[PDB]
């Protein structure tokens, strides 16, 4: 052990490629616990080995068995959960939770550069890049009977799209990350490379269909639970008695069209711009005949902005103020509103994309706009021009 004061837990990053640095390969590879580079091992020739020698850096960890090594000796440090800084660095590459945990959750925590966050509310770099993965991994992992799922189990039996996905949950989650952000950079590369995520354009519904779409294909478990908890349904339907036709169509995401709207009509005041309540964008559910006959725990609203079929669909978009409160009610069934996809705008103008998230037990809401948070006041939230919701339906 008396190696282990040379580790330097903030050079560790654990959302890199995980690729040796030296031979670019994706086989058994280490991260080197001193400098915090990748490198393939672990035997004599290998780049870990050589490093350990040239570089004088002796401990590693294996980031597929997540077993430490010392090298150039080449044995194994047993009974590493016995050693805190050990633990600390397994934890960063693979959090791990009780039940008990969840109870807890979310609370504020400290980096290692002690920086506080709200654990569950963090924000992520690249989001010039990736803002719309961002929102919907942030959408996803605040659905509690989804992100329960993630945190307590594990899925080396239910392939690697699965398995990844689940450590990005697992990672939003953590009370005790390195530093108050996270990179899913690899991640939503690796859909493209080998899921064959190939969208163009990309928005955070288009992602969020995607994804629940290959959950649901990729696990038999988190299919039953994205369909009970997620999943609702419409129902559309019109002497000699005719019943006729009915349609019953499933849902992940209710798209709920806004009145027309003239890019070109221009104001000075918001009383001059146009304006609509969420009721009255569901009254066609509430008033042929339109019916939402299941009504899910987590109800999944789209605002139409785009016409992506006509030219420049982000400067043309819709941009009718959609008012809301916290609270809304569809015959009877009460709903609080809990997240809050917003569109920001920064040939066409371009789509960034930010997510507010509200947290039930401080009764804050926190923005999260690339790597930064925020609180914002809930009675004012709809002043941004919202894109997704998520309402999640009350006793
Ligand atoms: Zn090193």
């Known amino acids: 052990y008396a190696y282990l004061e040379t580790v330097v837990r903030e050079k560790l990053d654990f959302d890199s490629e995980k690729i040796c640095c030296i031979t670019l390969s994706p086989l058994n590879v280490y991260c080197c616990l001193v400098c915090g580079h990748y490198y393939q091992g672990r035997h004599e020739k290998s780049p870990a080995f050589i490093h350990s020698i040239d570089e004088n850096h002796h401990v590693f960890?294996?980031?597929?068995?997540?077993?430490?090594?010392?090298?150039?000796?080449?044995?194994?440090?047993?009974?590493?959960?016995?050693?805190?800084?050990?633990?600390?660095?397994?934890?960063?590459?693979?959090?791990?939770?009780?039940?008990?945990?969840?109870?807890?959750?979310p609370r504020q925590c400290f980096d290692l550069s002690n920086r506080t966050y709200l654990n569950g509310f963090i924000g992520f770099t690249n989001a010039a890049t990736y803002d719309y993965a961002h929102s919907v991994l942030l959408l996803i992992s605040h659905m509690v009977p989804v992100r329960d799922h993630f945190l307590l189990n594990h899925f080396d039996n239910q392939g690697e799209f699965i398995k990844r996905l689940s450590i990005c949950v697992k990672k939003?989650?953590?009370?005790?990350?390195?530093?108050?952000?996270?990179?899913?950079?690899?991640?939503?590369?690796?859909?493209?490379?080998?899921?064959?995520?190939?969208?163009?354009?990309?928005?955070?519904?288009?992602?969020?269909?995607?994804?629940?779409?290959?959950?649901?294909?990729?696990?038999?478990?988190?299919?039953?639970?994205?369909?009970?908890?997620?999943?609702?349904?419409?129902?559309?339907?019109?002497?000699?008695?005719?019943?006729?036709?009915?349609?019953?169509?499933?849902?992940?995401?209710?798209?709920?069209?806004?009145?027309?709207?003239?890019?070109?009509?221009?104001?000075?005041?918001?009383?001059?711009l146009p304006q609509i309540n969420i009721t009255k964008l569901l009254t066609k559910f509430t008033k042929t005949v339109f019916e939402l006959t299941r009504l899910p725990q987590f109800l999944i609203f789209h605002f139409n902005r785009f016409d992506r079929n006509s030219?420049?669909?982000?400067?043309?978009?819709?941009?009718?103020?959609?008012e809301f409160s916290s609270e809304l009610e569809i015959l009877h069934?009460?709903?609080?509103?809990?997240?809050?996809?917003?569109?920001?705008?920064?040939?066409?103008?371009?789509?960034?994309?930010?997510?507010?998230?509200?947290?039930?037990?401080?009764?804050?809401?926190?923005?999260?706009?690339?790597?930064?948070?925020?609180?914002?006041?809930?009675?004012?939230?709809?002043?941004?021009?919202?894109?997704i919701q998520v309402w999640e339906k009350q006793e």
């Open 172 to 272: 939003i989650w953590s009370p005790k990350l390195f530093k108050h952000h996270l990179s899913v950079d690899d991640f939503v590369s690796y859909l493209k490379v080998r899921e064959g995520l190939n969208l163009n354009p990309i928005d955070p519904r288009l992602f969020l269909l995607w994804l629940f779409n290959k959950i649901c294909s990729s696990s038999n478990d988190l299919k039953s639970i994205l369909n009970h908890s997620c999943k609702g349904k419409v129902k559309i339907a019109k002497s000699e008695s005719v019943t006729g036709k009915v349609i019953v169509k499933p849902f992940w995401v209710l798209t709920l069209d806004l009145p027309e709207f003239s890019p070109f009509e221009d104001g000075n005041s918001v009383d001059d």
């Open 311 to 322: 030219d420049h669909p982000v400067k043309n978009r819709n941009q009718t103020l959609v």
């Open 61 to 105: 960890l294996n980031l597929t068995s997540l077993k430490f090594y010392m090298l150039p000796q080449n044995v194994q440090i047993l009974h590493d959960g016995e050693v805190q800084l050990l633990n600390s660095i397994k934890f960063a590459a693979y959090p791990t939770y009780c039940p008990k945990d969840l109870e807890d959750f």
């Open 333 to 387: 069934v009460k709903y609080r509103l809990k997240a809050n996809v917003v569109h920001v705008v920064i040939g066409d103008e371009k789509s960034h994309w930010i997510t507010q998230l509200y947290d039930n037990k401080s009764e804050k809401w926190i923005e999260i706009d690339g790597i930064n948070t925020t609180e914002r006041e809930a009675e004012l939230l709809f002043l941004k021009e919202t894109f």
